[PDB]
C-alpha cells in the first residue's frame with residue numbers, strides 16, 4: 001500500500017541567453033507517451049529517454065502546468081492528506097511556485113465555502129538560506145535573524161520551528177497583501193535560497209448530532225534553488241537512498257530535508273515539477289534534473305488522512 005511520488009517534467013522555451021550562444025534544441029517532450037528524450041551529442045541518434053507521470057513541452061504555459069498538478073492536489077488537501085509539491089528548475093513573464101499561491105487559496109476557499117463547510121486557513125512562509133531558517137511573514141522582527149528548530153517527541157520523526165508566524169486567512173485577498181510583504185523581506189541581493197510556503201486547513205463537519213468529523217489538510221509549496229548547497233545536495237542523497245534502499249537516509253544532514261522528511265518516503269502525498277532547458281548549452285544540468293526526477297518517481301510514500309471522528 002502506497003503512492004509513488006508524482007513526477008512531471010516540463011520543458012521551457014529557449015531563453016535569450018541561449019539564442020545568443022547559438023545553442024541548438026536537444027530535448028523532445030512527448031506528452032502523449034509521457035516521455036522526455038535528450039540528444040547526448042552532435043545527424044546523430046545518440047539518445048537517453050525517460051518516462052514520467054506527465055510531460056509538457058514548451059508550448060504549454062507554466063501556469064497550465066502548475067494547474068494540471070496543483071488543482072488535483074488541492075482536492076487531496078481537502079480530503080485531509082498532507083501534500084507537498086517540489087518545484088525545481090524555475091527562472092511574457094516567468095513566475096516561481098509562489099506566483100500561484102493566490103490562485104491556490106482561491107480554489108481552496110471556493111471549494112470549502114460553496115460547500116457551506118466550516119474551516120480555518122493559516123499560512124506560513126520560510127526561506128532556507130545557507131542552512132539557516134528565515135521567517136518571511138514576521139513583520140517587526142529584525143530581517144537578519146533566524147529561527148530555531150528541535151525535534152518534537154509528539155511527532156518523533158518531525159520537527160518544530162519555534163517563532164514561525166502562522167497567519168490566518170479569511171478572504172482570498174489577504175493572500176496578496178501578505179504574499180507581497182513577504183517578497184519585500186527576502187530582498188537582500190535569494191538566488192541560492194529555498195522557499196517553503198505552507199497552507200494549513202482545519203475543517204469541521206457535523207455527521208449526525210453527537211458526532212463531528214474534524215480533518216486537517218496541509219499543503220507545502222517548495223521552490224527549490226537551482227544549482228555547495230547542503231539542502232539541495234542532501235535532497236539528492238535522500239532521493240538516492242530511498243531508491244537504493246540504503247538503511248540510513250541522511251534526512252538530518254540538512255535543514256530542508258529535515259523540515260520536509262515526511263515528503264520523502266513519509267506519510268505525505270508528494271509531487272515534483274522539474275523544468276528543463278531545451279538548449280544544448282545545458283545538457284549536463286538537464287541530464288542531471290532528469291536523473292533525480294527519474295529516481296524520485298520510484299519512491300513510495302504512504303499517505304494517511306488526518307481526521308478525528
Ligand SMILES: NS(=O)(=O)c1ccc(-c2ccc(C(F)(F)F)c(F)c2)cc1
Nearest residue numbers: 088227232233236272274289292293296
Ligand atoms: N548540487 S547537487 O549536485 O548536490 C544537486 C543538484 C540538484 C539536485 C536535484 C535536481 C533535480 C531534482 C528534482 F528531482 F526535484 F527535480 C532534485 F530533487 C534534486 C540534487 C543535487
